[PDB]
Amino acid sequence: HHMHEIVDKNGKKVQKNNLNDEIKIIFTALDGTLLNSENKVSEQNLESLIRAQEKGIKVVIATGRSIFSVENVIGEHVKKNRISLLPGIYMNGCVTFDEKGSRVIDRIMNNDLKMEIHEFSKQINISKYAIWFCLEKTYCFEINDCIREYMEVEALNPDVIEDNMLEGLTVYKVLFSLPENILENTLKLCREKFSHRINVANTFQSYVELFHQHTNKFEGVKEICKYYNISLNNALAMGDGENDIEMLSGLTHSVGVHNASEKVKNSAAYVGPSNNEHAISHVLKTFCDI
Ligand SMILES: O=P(O)(O)OC[C@H]1O[C@H](O)[C@@H](O)[C@@H](O)[C@@H]1O
């Protein structure tokens, strides 16, 4: 079967003996890539991560999430030191930590732009779907089934605040948890209004994230590789969503998971197993020989 294979653009399996780069470090998206559809690390993936640690391969989370929600989803693994959150790439790069928890990237949204996005969101009536991200906390203006759905998957609940409190907050990103029915049009409206102003990414399902326009996960990847004196050619990125495209196309070695959109797969060097098929386990086997 094709379930566990990794192949190049021509559909040929990638072979270890044809690789000329040692892979020292793996950057992975969490939801949709490392985590299966139940938001869990599969046992096969876990087993391979244990081997990766034994061999000194670094595995770095690269996510739109804050480090706080990541710890809420995978905390049992973090507590056992099976997955390290420091260094890590959070909020799509806008908060990137080194191993001491220092921010090697801190990209705060300009406050005028924040308020312009806020007012625009109230004008097109998606403000009720907004989750605003400060460094340590998240905020929303109400709770509805879309906010509920975000809370369930995110596993970290925003505080409910009044509209007028946003002005005083210092924010990195906003995430809109949208109804499916308005996603496509809302995405168009945000991209037309905010081009050359902010990044606009449809990250998972109906979620739309806006974050500093010059930052993305690959910027985080470069800083963490720099930290460890690792050439980009010794790094591999794996991902599923729009917010992974820069890191997949920026690294010579990159793997889109089978469940990714064609657009995301196009940006990646190789296509691997789906997130439900233990993708990092097979990446580790192919690139690192386990
Ligand atoms: O960046 P990652 O780790 O792939 O996860 C991204 C996803 O995280 C969670 O599932 C949600 O917040 C989604 O809105 C988001 O798209």
Ligand SMILES: [Mg+2]
């Ligand atoms: Mg993802």
